[PDB]
Amino acid sequence: SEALKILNNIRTLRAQARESTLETLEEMLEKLEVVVNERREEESAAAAEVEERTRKL
Template identity: 55%
Template sequence: MSDSLKYFKSLNNIRTLRAIAREMPLESLQEIHDKFNTVVDERREDENQARAQLEAHSQKIAKYIKLLEGEGLSLDDLVTAKIPSKTQNRVKRTIKPAKYHYQDKNGEIKTWTGQGRIPDAIKKAMQQKGKKLDDFLI
């Protein structure tokens, strides 16, 4: 437990408070009283706001439950419902036939459909040897 919390717990004892109050001037006690009241008022306001937000949230939930019941649905229906995802509706792309062939740096013959990035081997041949893309047609 932190020291400040121990200190505040000791302030909860009326005898301790009276002993401290006897040693302090009345002006200091009044200043402490005013500051403490300010802190309590702020805390009370925070609690009221939190309670109001919780109440508003509960009212919204009740409103939607009523709407669901009006449509003949329950919360269980929503929880167990299987909602189709967007990925299930996608049409699978057909594989395109190869249009070009080339030899990679390992000497293997590879093919390319003409879609996507140009393979490095074709790009180098076009830049360094002056070949054209048509030279790689199948």
């Protein structure tokens, strides 16, 4: 929901921004990368931590 609303989906952005500069991305895209930036470095971490064998039901 946050990744969808962050940029509000390129579908509407490209249009609302169509009447301006791509800076819209520098606004949303720059944060859209930072949002996943944390998730990018943490998720990889979560995957390694969880592994597969470990679970304990």
